[PDB]
Amino acid sequence: SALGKLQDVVNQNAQALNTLVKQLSSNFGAISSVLNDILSRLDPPEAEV
Amino acid sequence: FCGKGYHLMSFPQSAPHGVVFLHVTYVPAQEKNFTTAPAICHDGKAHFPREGVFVSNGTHWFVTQRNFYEPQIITTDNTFVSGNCDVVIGIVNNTVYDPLQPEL
Amino acid sequence: YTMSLGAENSVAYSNNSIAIPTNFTISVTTEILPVSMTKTSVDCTMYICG
Amino acid sequence: DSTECSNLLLQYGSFCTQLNRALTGIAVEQDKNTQEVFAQVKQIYKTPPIKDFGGFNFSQILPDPSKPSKRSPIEDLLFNKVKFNGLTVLPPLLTDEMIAQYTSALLAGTITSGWTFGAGPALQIPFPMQMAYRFNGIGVTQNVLYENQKLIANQFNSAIGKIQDSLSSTP
Numbered sequence: 318s319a320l321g322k323l324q325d326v327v328n329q330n331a332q333a334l335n336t337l338v339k340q341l342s343s344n345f346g347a348i349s350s351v352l353n354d355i356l357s358r359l360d361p362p363e364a365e366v
Numbered sequence: 367f368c369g370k371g372y373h374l375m376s377f378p379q380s381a382p383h384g385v386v387f388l389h390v391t392y393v394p395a396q397e398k399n400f401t402t403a404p405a406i407c408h409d410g411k412a413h414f415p416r417e418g419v420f421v422s423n424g425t426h427w428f429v430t431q432r433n434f435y436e437p438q439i440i441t442t443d444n445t446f447v448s449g450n451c452d453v454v455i456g457i458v459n460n461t462v463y464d465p466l467q468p469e470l
Numbered sequence: 471y472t473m474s475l476g477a478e479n480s481v482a483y484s485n486n487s488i489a490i491p492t493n494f495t496i497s498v499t500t501e502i503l504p505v506s507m508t509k510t511s512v513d514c515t516m517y518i519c520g
Numbered sequence: 521d522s523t524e525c526s527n528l529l530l531q532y533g534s535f536c537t538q539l540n541r542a543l544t545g546i547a548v549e550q551d552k553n554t555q556e557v558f559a560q561v562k563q564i565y566k567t568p569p570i571k572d573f574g575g576f577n578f579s580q581i582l583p584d585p586s587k588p589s590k591r592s593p594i595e596d597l598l599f600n601k602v603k604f605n606g607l608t609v610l611p612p613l614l615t616d617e618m619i620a621q622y623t624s625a626l627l628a629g630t631i632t633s634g635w636t637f638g639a640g641p642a643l644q645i646p647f648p649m650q651m652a653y654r655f656n657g658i659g660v661t662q663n664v665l666y667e668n669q670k671l672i673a674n675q676f677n678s679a680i681g682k683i684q685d686s687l688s689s690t691p
């Protein structure tokens with residue numbers, strides 16, 4: 318644990334990026350987290366929503 | 367600021383996204399008990415140490431540097447005089463040697 | 471348990487007693503500090519809309 | 521406690537996890553802050569039974585044993601002067617009593633051994649002699665203190681008394 322001070326910085330930043338990327342798998346209330354599924358399934362007036 | 371103890375020097379080492387400092391310090395060891403006094407009374411005059419502190423081994427008085435025990439004879443060359451022996455609290459009676467005396 | 475804050479120690483204080491080191495040790499200690507982070511960058515439009 | 525809301529909340533990803541982690545990090549830091557300031561001694565130093573420091577009185581900063589909290593007169597003054605929604609408060613690792621103990625160890629160390637305990641072993645020195653060294657530090661010869669010891673002790677003792685009077689009054 319001698320160099321925990323430096324490792325902690327690396328770990329915190331890696332964690333932040335992993336979270337940022339994982340959020341792209343969330344729906345946020347949308348029918349799908351995948352943008353292509355929305356465009357393929359719905360006509361423009363509904364896809365935009 | 368630069369490690370525990372009395373700072374002597376430091377050496378940098380580089381590290382991944384950071385720096386490591388190796389701090390070299392002086393640490394006192396193996397202390398001994400001595401009897402002390404604020405001043406020495408001689409010829410009605412109060413003598414104070416110029417650099418160190420007055421200590422006694424139980425029978426004899428010496429003056430030594432503060433951070434390392436290295437006892438020396440109390441002389442006019444390592445003390446200074448200020449005032450008489452009436453003011454200082456805890457002043458003790460001890461001869462102060464004058465290096466010129468043996469010459470004259 | 472209730473933690474202790476360290477060993478108890480009382481200094482042999484008196485009005486005419488002094489302690490003086492007769493020896494010393496050279497000690498070397500290490501101190502580690504962070505200086506920088508990974509320089510990340512994100513393309514907003516690409517992240518959001520691909 | 522609504523299941524319908526909870527199921528909808530899950531669709532927003534890990535926002536809640538991030539928020540919980542941020543607050544946990546702060547809570548931990550608060551104990552690190554206290555530890556760094558107060559826990560600077562590896563030993564708990566005690567003052568002598570006989571408070572003879574050459575006329576220098578420290579009774580207002582040293583622990584008062586008549587108090588259950590074992591706080592000084594000044595500390596006691598300082599302390600007197602200053603869920604339904606899933607909100608909680610966590611206790612500090614160190615209690616007020618433990619912090620007070622650290623402070624008293626620092627005071628006992630300074631009074632009996634000057635600065636030596638902060639850089640190694642605690643080495644006893646007469647308080648008047650410690651002050652004499654501190655006078656040298658500021659470019660004043662030692663004899664100035666020894667020849668004015670009563671005056672210096674009196675000025676010191678009065679200054680400390682003024683501190684308590686100021687704090688107890690100024691709102």
Ligand SMILES: *[C@@H]1O[C@H](CO)[C@@H](O[C@@H]2O[C@H](CO)[C@@H](O)[C@H](O)[C@H]2NC(C)=O)[C@H](O)[C@H]1NC(C)=O
Nearest residue numbers: 393394395396397435491492493494495496497
């Ligand atoms: C000051 O301390 C040093 C150790 O830090 C002493 O040196 C050691 O002395 C012992 C014998 O008593 C040897 O066996 C060790 O090998 C020595 N160590 C080193 C690094 O030399 C030194 O003698 C002490 N000085 C005095 C006056 O006691």
Ligand SMILES: *[C@@H]1O[C@H](CO)[C@@H](O[C@@H]2O[C@H](CO)[C@@H](O)[C@H](O)[C@H]2NC(C)=O)[C@H](O)[C@H]1NC(C)=O
Nearest residue numbers: 571572573575576577578579580593677681684
């Ligand atoms: C150190 O100072 C304190 C505070 O001035 C002294 O306590 C006072 O002592 C007198 C005489 O017994 C009492 O009448 C006061 O009421 C005390 N004041 C407080 C706040 O308690 C204490 O006596 C002094 N110690 C020495 C050795 O002089």
Ligand SMILES: *[C@@H]1O[C@H](CO)[C@@H](O)[C@H](O)[C@H]1NC(C)=O
Nearest residue numbers: 396397398399400482483489
């Ligand atoms: C100095 O004397 C005290 C007792 O008054 C003793 O406890 C302490 O260990 C002594 N210090 C040394 C270095 O011998």
Ligand SMILES: *[C@@H]1O[C@H](CO)[C@@H](O)[C@H](O)[C@H]1NC(C)=O
Nearest residue numbers: 422423424425426427428437
């Ligand atoms: C004090 O030092 C002197 C000079 O070295 C020596 O003659 C004397 O015996 C010492 N006294 C004691 C108690 O060691």
Ligand SMILES: *[C@@H]1O[C@H](CO)[C@@H](O)[C@H](O)[C@H]1NC(C)=O
Nearest residue numbers: 403404455456457485486646
């Ligand atoms: C120490 O206190 C005693 C009284 O117990 C006194 O006679 C002596 O002169 C004092 N010494 C110093 C250095 O203050």
Ligand SMILES: *[C@@H]1O[C@H](CO)[C@@H](O)[C@H](O)[C@H]1NC(C)=O
Nearest residue numbers: 407409410451457458459460
């Ligand atoms: C020091 O010596 C003087 C005489 O030169 C004497 O009057 C005085 O009482 C002595 N002080 C002590 C503490 O013995």
